[PDB]
Design a protein around this ligand. Structure first.
Ligand SMILES: COc1ccc2[nH]ncc2c1
Length: 282
């Protein structure tokens, strides 16, 4: 730690959580290991209010050059705050820690697949609108997500949807095994060139909307990941879900236009989806 550059240490101070402000419960994981080494924790704010948090231990960080790049990503991500985007509460410098808000209802895909939960069509469209608002915020900061899908959004105690799996919250599903070891959400040009843009996140958002309206059905279940490019080049697309309003399906189809410039912006998506949501009684 003494080997850290002083001007970088000064710059990261506003992101750094002192060890006396955080109680990490390394004896209890969140989501029974289905998110890697993410632990329950308690963060104390300046007023002494207890904040339930999710603590990720970054064990892949060894050298001081990796620590320094981690400090920078902490600095950049601390400026990303929106009601529909998972915020960074801070970082702690054992392995460096990432401190995130605790999400009571886990990932959005599991939530909508859960037989015990009964979201209405209106609630589902509401989740999509919240995702569009979070992406509208990321796009406005020129941040390209690259892995937008229902499994990568979370729900808090108030059922507020948060776009996750980016910045320091990335590799959300990276699990470590003892002996073992997103093409169906990707825009056609991303499958062809391996390049990602905000217009390719729009494509992914269209797929996420389809997941919401089918209550978490897997897209293209009968198509091999290799065969997806040819399938899309033939002009085939995901079909309209049973309980999906026609104007909402039109919005999905616009997201999958082969010309990236022809797809709506997240701003237009927020506009169009908010108008659709407002037609519903609740
Ligand atoms: C970065 O991975 C996670 C995983 C589960 C989580 N629950 N609440 C926050 C949170 C973050």
């Amino acid at each position: 730690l003494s080997a850290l550059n002083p001007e970088l240490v000064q710059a990261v101070q506003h992101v750094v959580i002192g060890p006396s402000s955080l109680i990490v419960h390394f004896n209890e994981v969140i989501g029974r290991g289905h998110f890697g080494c993410v632990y329950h924790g308690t963060l104390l704010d300046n007023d002494g209010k207890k904040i339930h948090c999710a603590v990720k231990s970054l064990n892949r960080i060894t050298d001081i050059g990796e620590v320094s790049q981690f400090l920078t990503e902490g600095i950049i991500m601390k400026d990303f705050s929106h009601p529909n985007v998972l915020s960074l509460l801070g970082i702690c410098l054992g392995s460096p820690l990432v401190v995130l808000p605790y999400m009571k209802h886990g990932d959005l895909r599991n939530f909508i697949r859960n037989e015990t939960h009964n979201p209405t069509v209106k609630d589902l469209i509401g989740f999509g609108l919240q995702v569009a608002k979070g992406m509208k915020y990321l796009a406005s900061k020129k941040f390209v997500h690259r892995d937008l899908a229902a499994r990568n959004c979370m729900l808090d105690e108030k059922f507020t949807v948060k776009v996750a799996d980016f910045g320091l919250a990335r590799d959300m599903y990276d699990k470590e095994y003892y002996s073992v070891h997103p093409v169906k959400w990707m825009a056609l040009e991303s499958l062809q060139t391996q390049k990602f843009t905000t217009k390719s996140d729009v494509w992914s958002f269209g797929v996420l909307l389809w997941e919401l309206m089918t209550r978490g059905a897997p897209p293209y279940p009968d198509v091999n990941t290799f065969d997806i490019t040819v399938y899309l080049l033939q002009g085939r697309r995901l079909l309209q879900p049973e309980y999906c309003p026609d104007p909402l399906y039109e919005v999905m189809l616009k997201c999958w236009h082969p010309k990236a410039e022809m797809r709506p912006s997240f701003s237009e998506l927020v506009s169009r989806i908010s108008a659709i949501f407002s037609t519903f009684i609740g």
